[PDB]
Design a protein around this nucleic acid. Structure first.
Ligand SMILES: Nc1ccn([C@H]2CC[C@@H](COP(=O)(O)OP(=O)(O)OP(=O)(O)O)O2)c(=O)n1
Ligand SMILES: [Mg+2]
Ligand code: NA
Length: 346
DNA sequence: AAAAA
DNA sequence: TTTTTGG
DNA sequence: AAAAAC
């Protein structure tokens, strides 16, 4: 009957009855990220996450009793929204010049907190003024970010994600016919949209060399068809992103392939290749959500004295690595009831 | 910013 | 009170 | 040797 402070001990489905509160908390968290207040940022992200798990809307302050991750500052914000349907705090952030510039600049692929801060201090306020500047030097990632901006800023829907899945699977089985391809991320959690389409690729019989060459073979095949708009292949190195071999792509998705102008759409696609025995850890890590993953690792450390990541699960007391053929086995090792992928939308 | 140590 | 917050 | 990419 007691709501846990850990997302991995909550069922969070896509039906959010508290969007008025969580949209405001998400804006306040984002501003704290920009102001480098990591602590206050994480407190607003946890409060937003717990409200997303509620099976009813908050309509009075009494409704917040017993809910964790809701301290005094957060309850003041909830009180203000109950008062007149708006957050004065979130409204002030939305009107702030630094906040507006950071949101706009980081909306470009290849632009993060550091580059957005640099451009703001240089006096830039619009993407048109940045792009047309003759002194600025752009990374290959930023050039692609600006060239395919309108397509990348529009969300990827389910017919588009499915069309991408078909392309990925048909390219992959051409070089590794026994390979298992799984769509991960938001779409695996039941989402109708996303900023990208992510896939986990694994093969039970492939060699170390075959496993290494698959992403190169698949991207060369797409490069030949003129479908590869951007490609960054990070070699495996198996504290940041995981060491598995991965690639961050922009693919040309022809309209004819989508069962739902220029006749195509630029789509952000990420592919991850992992060894067959680590497929459960990689699937769990790549399914998300971000908050679900954070709390899984926090719970493992603080409550079980275990260490979890996308590649393994280590027990510090028994001094052994724990092995798993499925996500269910990882949850069981952690002493957690199994949370379905569509229930991990924390 | 909130909860654990 | 001080420490931790995915790493 | 910094920045972005999850
Ligand atoms: N900081 C992060 C970012 C991502 N992930 C994991 C969970 C999701 C997976 C994919 O990353 P995203 O593409 O950013 O995830 P998303 O769930 O697919 O959100 P969206 O539907 O907008 O693409 O990696 C994580 O553990 N920590
Ligand atoms: Mg995604
Ligand atoms: Na960006």
């Amino acid at each position: 009957k007691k709501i846990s402070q850990y997302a991995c001990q909550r069922r969070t489905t896509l039906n959010n009855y508290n969007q008025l509160f969580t949209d405001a908390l998400d804006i306040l968290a984002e501003n704290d990220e920009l102001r480098e207040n990591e602590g206050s940022c994480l407190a607003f992200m946890r409060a937003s996450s717990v409200l997303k798990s509620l099976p009813f809307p908050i309509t009075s302050m009494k409704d917040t009793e017993g809910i964790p991750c809701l301290g005094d500052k957060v309850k003041s914000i909830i009180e203000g929204i109950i008062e007149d349907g708006e957050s004065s705090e979130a409204k002030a952030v939305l009107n702030d010049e630094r906040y507006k510039s950071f949101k706009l600049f980081t909306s470009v692929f290849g632009v993060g907190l550091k580059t957005a801060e640099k451009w703001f201090r240089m006096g830039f306020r619009t993407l048109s003024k940045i792009q047309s500047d003759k002194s600025l030097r752009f990374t290959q990632m930023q050039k692609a970010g600006f060239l395919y901006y309108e397509d990348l800023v529009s969300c990827v829907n389910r017919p588009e994600a499915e069309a991408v899945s078909m392309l990925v699977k048909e390219a992959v089985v051409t070089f590794l016919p026994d390979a298992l391809v799984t769509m991960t991320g938001g779409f695996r959690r039941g989402k109708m949209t996303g900023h990208d389409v992510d896939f986990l690729i694994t093969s039970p019989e492939a060699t170390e060399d075959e496993e290494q060459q698959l992403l190169h073979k698949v991207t060369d095949f797409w490069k030949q068809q003129g479908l590869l708009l951007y490609c960054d292949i990070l070699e495996s190195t198996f504290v940041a992103l995981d060491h598995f071999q991965k690639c961050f792509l922009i693919l040309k998705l022809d309209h004819g392939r989508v069962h739902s102008g220029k006749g195509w759409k630029a789509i952000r696609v990420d592919l991850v290749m992992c060894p067959y025995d680590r497929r459960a850890f990689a699937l769990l890590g790549w399914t998300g959500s971000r908050q679900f993953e954070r709390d899984l690792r926090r719970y493992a450390t603080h409550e079980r004295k275990m260490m979890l990541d996308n590649h393994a699960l280590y027990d510090r007391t028994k001094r052994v690595f724990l092995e798993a053929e499925s996500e269910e086995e990882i949850f069981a090792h952690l002493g957690l009831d199994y949370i379905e992928p569509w229930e991990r939308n924390a």
